[PDB]
């Protein structure tokens, strides 16, 4: 049996983080917490979710189980759950998922996990630049950039960290030195990315949440978001855009 109780904010956060890339997904309930990951059908972005058991108000299982969930459905339902509302997820039989909150009980057919596209493997990315800042700031920088290009460049060296976008008539540049960042190794890196993925990523973060960036040169970027008061960890890995002829 699986019987956990979490807050609405926590549940609404992972369903969104996930649904942003995939429609169905394998959710793993492990001894140390909830885990899940998927790659969007573009084969461009990857999201890895981890919610440690202590984040849950209650987290009971008899063994480590894996379930196939229709995320579009869970997302749709979580809109009815309130932020400060407490929600109970229950999996008694092996074919239906129960979601409780308020005076409502929602049931849904599970998907045979084996039927869902085998999840990808957690990559091994050793990268130069390491940046830790407020997700809120990052969010604003991307939004500004979004008004200029469909792509931005993440640049990094001893001077600091920079996000830049270029139009044919104007440009915009975001910049922070070690003094302003929470942590900064001054590593050297440069990569280009699509602004649209970054915005979609930022939809699950706000001011006060921590963001850790792992950046390299012409390599995927690691955006590790720590949300809901440090109760959840949502990691997005995005493939880069490549210039050529």
């Amino acid at each position: 049996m699986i019987d956990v109780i979490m807050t609405g904010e926590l549940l609404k956060t992972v369903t969104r983080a996930i649904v942003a890339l995939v429609s169905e997904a394998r959710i793993h309930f492990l001894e140390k917490g909830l885990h899940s990951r998927a790659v969007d059908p573009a084969n461009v972005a990857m999201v890895i979710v981890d919610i440690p058991k202590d984040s849950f108000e209650v987290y009971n299982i008899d063994e480590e189980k894996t379930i196939g969930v229709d995320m579009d459905r869970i997302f749709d339902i979580s809109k009815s759950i309130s932020t400060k509302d407490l929600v109970e997820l229950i999996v008694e039989d092996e074919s239906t998922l129960k979601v409780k909150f308020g005076s409502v009980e929602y049931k849904v057919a599970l998907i045979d996990p084996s039927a869902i596209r085998k999840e990808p493997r957690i990559p091994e990315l050793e990268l130069p630049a390491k940046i830790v800042m407020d997700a809120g700031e990052f969010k604003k920088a991307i939004a500004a950039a979004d008004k200029i290009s469909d792509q931005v460049i993440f640049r990094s060296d001893k001077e600091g960290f920079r996000i830049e976008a270029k139009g044919d008539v104007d440009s915009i540049v975001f910049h922070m030195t070690e003094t302003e960042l929470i942590e900064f190794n001054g590593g050297e890196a440069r990569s280009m990315f699509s602004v649209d993925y970054l915005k979609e990523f930022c939809k699950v973060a706000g001011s006060g949440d921590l963001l850790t960036i792992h950046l390299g040169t012409n390599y995927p970027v690691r955006l590790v978001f720590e949300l809901v008061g440090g109760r959840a960890k949502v990691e997005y890995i995005l493939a880069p855009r490549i210039e050529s002829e």
Binding site: N43, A45, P120, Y219, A239, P240, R241, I242, E243, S244
Partner: peptide
């Protein structure tokens, strides 16, 4: 030009 790379170009 500008192309979008696939994620498995690196996890390969």
């Amino acid at each position: 030009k500008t192309t979008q790379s696939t994620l498995d170009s690196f996890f390969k």
